[PDB]
Amino acid sequence: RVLLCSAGHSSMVVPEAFHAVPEGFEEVHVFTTDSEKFNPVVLNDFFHSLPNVRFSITKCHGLADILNERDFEFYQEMLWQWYLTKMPDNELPYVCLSGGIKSMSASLQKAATLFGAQSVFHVLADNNPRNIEEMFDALQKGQIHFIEMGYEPGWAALRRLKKILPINEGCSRDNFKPLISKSIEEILSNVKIMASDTGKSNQLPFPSLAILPPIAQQWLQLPLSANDGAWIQNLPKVDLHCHLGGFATSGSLLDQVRGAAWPRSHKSISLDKYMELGNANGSKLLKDKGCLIRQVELLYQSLVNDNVAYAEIRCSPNNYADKNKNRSAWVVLQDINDTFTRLITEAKQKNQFYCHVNLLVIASRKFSGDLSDISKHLALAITAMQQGEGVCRIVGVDLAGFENKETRASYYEHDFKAVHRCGLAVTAHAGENDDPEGIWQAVYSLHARRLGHALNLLEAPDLMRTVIERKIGVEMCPYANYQIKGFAPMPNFSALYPLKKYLEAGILVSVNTDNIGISGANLSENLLILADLCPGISRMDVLTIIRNSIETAFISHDFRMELLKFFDRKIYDVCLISIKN
Amino acid sequence: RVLLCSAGHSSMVVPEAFHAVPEGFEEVHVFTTDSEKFNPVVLNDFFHSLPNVRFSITKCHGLADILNERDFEFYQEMLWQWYLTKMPDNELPYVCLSGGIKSMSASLQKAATLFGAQSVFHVLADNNPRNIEEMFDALQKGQIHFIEMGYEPGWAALRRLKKILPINEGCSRDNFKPLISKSIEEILDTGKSNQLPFPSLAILPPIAQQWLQLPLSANDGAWIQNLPKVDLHCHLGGFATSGSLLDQVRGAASEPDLIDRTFSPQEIAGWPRSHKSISLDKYMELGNANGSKLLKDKGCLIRQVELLYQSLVNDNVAYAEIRCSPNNYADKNKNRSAWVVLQDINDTFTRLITEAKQKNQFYCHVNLLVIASRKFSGDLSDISKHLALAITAMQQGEGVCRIVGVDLAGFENKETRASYYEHDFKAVHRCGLAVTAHAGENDDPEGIWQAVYSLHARRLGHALNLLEAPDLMRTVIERKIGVEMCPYANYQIKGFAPMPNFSALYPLKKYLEAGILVSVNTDNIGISGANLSENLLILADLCPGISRMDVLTIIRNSIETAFISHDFRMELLKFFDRKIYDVCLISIKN
C-alpha cells in the first residue's frame, strides 16, 4: 500500500491521511514545490518515530508556485511524472487530495483518474491542528474525518508509460520535454478520431494495441524498412520450428560442445548439403551426456538472447541413444526435458524474461530401414507426454524425413490411428518436392494441425481454400527457401516469395528458424530478410505473423491466454518506446 | 453554450471565466453551497448588463458547507442531479473550477469526468482582484491566465439518467441510489482481462470498459437487442408456426382451398418458459401446423422466406445461416423439383439482400445450409441426392446468397454415429463445401470422435454431454471445432436449472471457461417461441454469473466458426467491431 499526497504550505494532510486507514500504510510519498514556506521537519520526525514504514519527499525544482500557463503546465508534468515513478508495480495506491491549493488538488485528481488509484480520499480538520501530540489528541476525540471520493480504475494503457521515462535524470528547462502531454494528447486524439470518423473508426483489426498514438499507427502502416533491425530485435518473437541437433554446426558452438564433453549465399542447392555440413554434430557427437547438456544450455541461452518468448523444439531421441552405455532414447528424452525445465525454473525464479520451450518428437522417414522405428517413436512420444509434471512437455510429433511419392501420407497412416486418440498433435513436411494430392491427404488423413513449407500452394486454388478454411498453419522459413530455392532477387531466379500472397489470402503463416546453426541466422534475421526479399511488406504484417505463430502453437487454452496477455503488454511497451527513436 | 461554475470564498470568478472564450458565452448557471460568503447580488448586477445571457442561480439548500461524510454525500448527489438536469441536450456543458474548497471542486471534477464537459479549465489572477475595476486591468495586462488542462469528452453517452431517473430538483439524500457506486466499486482474472474481442472496446472510457465485466442481468434487454448478433443454427421450416405469421403465410398461398385451417398445436403453460421438461416428439408435433405439409405452395414458400428475413433484420442480426430441406418441399405434380425450390429460395434471398443494400439500410447477409436428414423409413439414396444437389448449388457460383455447406441431423434412435452415412461424405470435401454434424444430443460421446476425425465436421450441434469426456473436450478445443447450442430449445426438451425437480446445470459457462468456440443460436424460432435476443438474454437465469464480455466473445466466436471466405470475414469483423462499439457507447447510457 502506497499513499501519495500533495504538499502546499501546511503539514495537515500527511499524518492524518497516514493513520486514516485503521491498518496504516507501508510507503508514503509526498509531492511539493520549490517554495520555502513548507517545512520538512515535522513529517520527517513523525515518520522517524516509526521507521518501519517508508517515507520520501519530492520537490519540484525551479518552481515556487504557479504564476502562468508555463508554471502550471510544468507543475502538472512534474506531478504526473512523480505519480508515474512512484506507481506501485501491481496494486493501485491510495491518494489524499486535501494538500495544496485547488489547482494542485485538481491536478492530483486528474492524475488519479488517468492512472488509476485504489481509493482516493479527503482529510479535513475543524481545529486546524499544528503539532503531533494534538493531532493525536484530535484523532482520539474523533474529530478526524475521511471523505472518500471513489475508486478510479484508470486507463490500463496509460500505466505502461513507465518504460519510456521513469525519470530524465532531473530534466532542466533547456532540455525539458512534455512526455505526459504526449500521453494525454495521444489518448484524446484516439478518442476524438473514434468519435469523428467511421472508416478508420471501424478498421481496427488487431489485438487491442489500438490505444497506441495515431503517429505510432501511421508508422506501423508504413512498409517495413531494413533499418528496423533494432525494433524487430526488441520485439518478442515465437519460433515454432527449430531443430535441436543443428545448432552447433558452425562457429565456436561446435568447439564449445566438443570441449564440454553465408548466410546470404546465392547458391541453389538440393539437400544433403545441410546433412553433411551438420555431420560434425548430432549423431556422431551427441552420443554422450555432457555434449547434449551443453547443447541444450547453449540453445536456451541463444533463444533467450533473441527475446524469444516461446518455442517448440523438434529432436531425435533415437539418434542420440547409446545402448552400449545403457543410454536409451527414453533416457535421452527425459534428460532433455529435465534440463529444459530446470533452465526454465531457474530463469523464472530470477523474475527475468524467460523462454518457455516445448518438445516435439520427430519420426524420421528412414523408409526401408527398420520399419518398426516409426511405431517405436510414436509410442515413445505417446508415453513421454504422460509424465505430466514439468513446465516443459511433449505436445506433438513430427513427420519430417525423406519425402517421396512412396513415402506419402498414405504410407504411414496405419500407425497414426492412436496419436490423435491419446491427445497428441501432428505436424508435417511436404510441398517442397511432393504433389498437391500428398498435401491434401496429409491435411485430411493424418489430421495435421500444422504444415511445413509447401511454397507451391498458389498452383492449387482448391487446396488453398481447403487449408485456409480449416485454419491449417504453415511453417515457412525464409532463409531455408532462400538458400534452397530462388528468392530475394536471386540471379537467374525470377521466382518470388509467396509470403505476401499467403498473408493476403489469410493463411496462418509462421516464420521459423528451421535450423539455426547450418543456416547461420536467427529468427530476427529471418524477419529482416523479408524487407528486401518481399517488397512492399509493412510492419503490421510482422505482428500478424507473430499472432499467427502464437495461434497455431500446440498449447493449452489457459497457456495461450497467458502468452497472449504477455505478448500484448510487451508489444505495447516496445512500440511505445521505439516510436520516439 | 452553457457554462457551470462553483465557488466558495471568491464571489465573482464567474465573470473572470466569462472572458475565457474571446467570442463570448451564452448561458451561465452557478451551483454552490448555502454559505453566505458567496455574493449573489454582484453576479446579478454583472449579468443584468447582458440580457442576452441567461443567468440562473441555484444553491445547495440546507448545507452551508461540507463538514462530514453525510453532508459531503448529500452535496454530491444534489450536484450530480443538478448537473444531469442542466446539461445541454446535444452539447457537453462548459464548466470551471477556479473557485470552491477541495470537497466541492473534487466532486464537480469527478462528475465532469463521468458525464462530460466541453472544456474544464482554471482561471487565476496574479493580483487576486477584489472588485471589477481591478479585474478589468488584470485581464488587460494579461495577468489573468486561462489555465486549461485538456478536453474532457467523458462518457459520450451517459445522460440517460436524466429521463430514466425523473428530474427531481427538490429532494434530499433520503432517497437516492448511486448506480455509479455499484458500477465502480468492483473493477479489478486472465479471462476477462485479455479475452476482449473487438479491439475498439479498449477505446471505451474506463467506466464502460469495466461495466462490460459486470454480471449480466435480465434488465439489459434493450442493450442485448441493440447489439448485432449472429445466428448459425436456424431452421427455415420452423419459422412460422402459430399466430399472425401462420395466418399471413396461409393467406399468401396460391390455392387457399386445400389449406388445413383446423389443426392447432396444443398450448404449454408458460411457453417458452416451460413448467416442465418435454420430449422431442411433442416438441416436433408442436410444429406440425407448418413444415412441409404447407410449404409446397410456391407463394407460401416466398412469403415464409420474406417473413423470416424480415424477422432476422428486426432482431438486429447482421449475419445468419439458414438450414433448409429442399427435397422436403419438392412436388413432381407441379414440376416443383427440389433444385427448383432451392434455386427459388436463393433468388428470393439475393433479391431481398440487394434491395435492402441499395437503400443503405441494415441487412443480414444470409447463406443456406442443406439438411441431409437421417431419412426415416429407409430410402438412404436421398443422402446422395442431397449431396449432389448441394454440390451443384455450390458451383453454381455467381450470386450473393451462396450455399456454404451441408448438415447431417436427425433422430438418435437409429444410433447413427457418423459411420452409417460416412460412405458418401468423402466427395463433399473435394468440391470445397463445409460439414456440420448434429452429434450427441442424448447419445454416447464416442460418435462425436468419428464425426470430428472422419466426417471432418467443422461444427457440432448441441453436444451438451461434452463435459463428461475430458479427452474429447481436449481435442474439441485443440481442433477449433465450433459447438452450436440453443438455450431455449435445450432447456425445453431436456430441462435445466432453475426448473424445479431438476439438478443438472447448463454447461455454457464451463464450456466458455474451457475455451470451446460455443455459439448461441435459436434452432426453431416458431416452435420455441423465442428469437435470438431472448435466447441470449435467458443466460442470466440459465448460467448465473455470466458477464457481458462473455456475450461479446460469444458473438466473436460465432463470427469465427461461420463458414465464410477470408475477405468477407474481415469486412464482417470490421463492421461488427464498429457497430458493437457504438452500441456499448450509446445503449447502456442508462
Ligand SMILES: Nc1ncnc2c1ncn2[C@@H]1O[C@H](COP(=O)(O)OP(=O)(O)OP(=O)(O)O)[C@@H](O)[C@H]1O
Ligand atoms: N509467459 C511468459 N513469457 C515470458 N515472460 C513472462 C511470462 N509470464 C510472465 N513473464 C515475465 O513477468 C514479468 C513481469 O514484468 P513487469 O510486468 O513488471 O514489466 P518489467 O519488469 O518492467 O519489464 P519486463 O517485462 O521486460 O520484465 C516479465 O518480465 C515477464 O518476463
Ligand SMILES: [Mg+2]
Ligand atoms: Mg526443419
Ligand SMILES: [Mg+2]
Ligand atoms: Mg436443429
